[PDB]
Design a protein around this ligand. Structure first.
Ligand code: HEM
Ligand code: HEM
Ligand code: HEM
Ligand code: HEM
Ligand SMILES: [Fe+3]
Ligand SMILES: [Fe+3]
Ligand SMILES: [Fe+3]
Ligand SMILES: [Fe+3]
Lengths: 180, 187, 187, 187
């Protein structure tokens, strides 16, 4: 998967304790981790159905000067998104994970958006939209989790925690130097 | 100066007596303190010349530009070099002009952490080489001591007193820095 | 000289390139090597005077006599001081006259181990303070560099070249020594 | 596992086609790959039993304890044996379960370097026999292939397929390892 760089990115400038504390704040414990892995079992063969709901805000996949969406941008991102679905549910949330989530935040940010796919695109995804997205990208997943309640709630709250945690990480390049 | 946190950092886990003893081991007495202050007078307007020798985007960075680089591409990070250089310029005057008290100790410890995987890159939010090996921190004692001497002389006992004081300080600092690098009980 | 094992020790777990790079970092070039050899000429007959300043049961030892002492009584161990002093006298000339090759590196590593809890006291079969904290090894860089300079001058560019070479060597050595003191991946 | 660096080592200077051709020569095809994975299932919970046959402070020893020893005293280094044994336990499962891709190749090369004077002893910071002669690396192919077979059988075509796959892998690995041992153009 072109651009998919999980495990092959630089060290994010977020300490391991800050990360620990962030997971503590979203309440992502050992129960979540197992809920996440279970969800990975459940989402597993539903990824293309999930993708068809989400990717493949079209504006942010577009050329800004013409407003035309960039097929290959949509294509390549969708594949990395499909993998992120399973990275979210199945990776251990360790430094390697943290470092990729940071990368992914940079790729929404003017710092690296468009660079991974060599496209000429909308340079930057405003933070306000990254945070708003927390809701649709959390709630979209739940029917998927249920297609195969406590179970479903545990998986679904774990997904929720992860999406929040990720966006919390992503905010760091968007935030004023000392405000994150 | 972004990141420059002198006087605003947590307490280093080195006691005041350990610090006292460290200063006695490098032989940093009242004479040094005054030599240091005089050096502060002398270095004062030479800081950019000093910086151009040591750090910055367009400065001689021999073999250790890598540690200002992105590790995966090896490309130096301009702003990292920029922001560090400014804090380094201030450190030149912190070294010569601060009283070497708990506040100083606490900053030197911070500075050691910022070379260490504990906090390197965090202050400037950069994605960089995570860690500066201790071996290089100690080796650096020589170039960062000897580089300063022509500066001290540009405007002998005097110069030697200033220069030995600088030497003691650089050593003392690196001695402090080693603490996060050392095995739990070996420091 | 009992315990003096130059050229007779195991291979240090530091690569030849790491060593090369370390010498590059302290800036120890061909000029230094010759400065060192000249210093060997100059220090040559001053070794006992040097020793009386630094080590020996009847020396001007500082509070670091403790590290030559029995820890439970605090009594200095004459023979420990005696035997170490002799090896130190030889180290003075090893520093100035040996080629800084793998054989040298391997001895400097040994010497660092002998300050470390790994082998301190073993060479002289003494029951002594088990370990010399790294902080003190690094602080020592200053007194063991600066002590030598009057010696170099007793017989300026010359003296500075010899003296900076000695400085580089002391730093380089302590940089090597730090390896057994450092956390597995921090050196 | 300290030192265990699978997936974290530099690029081996062996091309992807040379590697492809090497796998072709040992006849390691898709059948082997699956045999290997099946062996991973089977060896799985037998690793400590395998280890006790091959490596460790108190493992049935050949006359190659020497290579885990201090060369000057001939004393085996417990922690060296300990740390290597753990990485060996992982190698058992790396051999059976990793895809034999560039990442794998790069680790096998690393592992060959760690037998070679290039890096032996460096990973565990030990002072040890500097180098494992190539002749012994190749001879080892037999015991490290044949030792595994009872393990594979404890749970024939199956067993032969797993066992020949293991054989191919051990050979392939040693073939890779030979590169740092070989004269510049002879590999
Ligand atoms: C309005 C909000 C969002 C917009 C407009 C948006 C748009 C985009 C765009 C344009 C890319 C490709 C960026 C590039 O690499 O150049 C991307 C990548 C990606 N986005 Fe979003 N995104 C939003 C929110 C989110 C959220 C909340 C998540 C998940 C927590 C997310 C997950 C991903 C993933 C997983 C990738 C691919 C990451 C990779 O490169 O592996 N996005 N998104
Ligand atoms: C005697 C040895 C050294 C001295 C006195 C020294 C001095 C300094 C100072 C004063 C700073 C900024 C402190 C602050 O942020 O408040 C700094 C940061 C830094 N120096 Fe050094 N330095 C030494 C060794 C080294 C070495 C060996 C390297 C290798 C490249 C290095 C590279 C860096 C880097 C990358 C930073 C930024 C660290 C960070 O991410 O915060 N320095 N140094
Ligand atoms: C506070 C720091 C130090 C103290 C307290 C100290 C004390 C000692 C002691 C007790 C020994 C013998 C240890 C043993 O083998 O059991 C020793 C050995 C020695 N030390 Fe130090 N030392 C210090 C730092 C240094 C430094 C910085 C140098 C030179 C760079 C140095 C040079 C030597 C030499 C040459 C020997 C004998 C090495 C040999 O056995 O051949 N020491 N020192
Ligand atoms: C006479 C031949 C051999 C001897 C004496 C020997 C001994 C050793 C020694 C001393 C080490 C640690 C080296 C270091 O310092 O890094 C080691 C590591 C290792 N050996 Fe061997 N070895 C031999 C051949 C082989 C063979 C044929 C294999 C299997 C293909 C093998 C598998 C391993 C593994 C997997 C490790 C650890 C790799 C790692 O660090 O991840 N060795 N062996
Ligand atoms: Fe930050
Ligand atoms: Fe401590
Ligand atoms: Fe090491
Ligand atoms: Fe070759």
């Amino acid at each position: 998967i072109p651009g998919y760089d999980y495990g092959r990115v630089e060290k994010s400038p977020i300490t391991d304790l800050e990360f620990d504390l962030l997971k503590k704040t979203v309440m992502l414990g050992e129960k979540d981790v197992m809920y996440l892995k279970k969800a990975g079992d459940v989402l597993k063969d539903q990824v293309d159905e999930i993708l068809d709901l989400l990717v493949g805000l079209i504006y942010y996949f577009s050329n800004p000067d013409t407003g035309e969406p960039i097929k290959e941008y949509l294509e390549r991102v969708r594949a990395r998104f499909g993998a992120w679905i399973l990275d979210t549910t199945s990776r251990d949330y360790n430094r390697e994970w943290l470092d990729y989530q940071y990368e992914v935040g940079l790729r929404h940010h003017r710092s690296k958006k468009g660079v991974t796919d060599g496209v000429r695109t909308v340079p930057h995804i405003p933070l306000r939209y990254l945070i708003a997205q927390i809701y649709p990208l959390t709630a979209t997943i739940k029917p998927f989790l249920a297609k195969k309640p406590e179970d479903i709630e545990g998986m679904y709250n774990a997904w929720f925690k992860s999406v929040v945690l990720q966006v919390a990480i992503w905010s760091h390049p968007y935030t004023k130097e000392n405000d994150w």
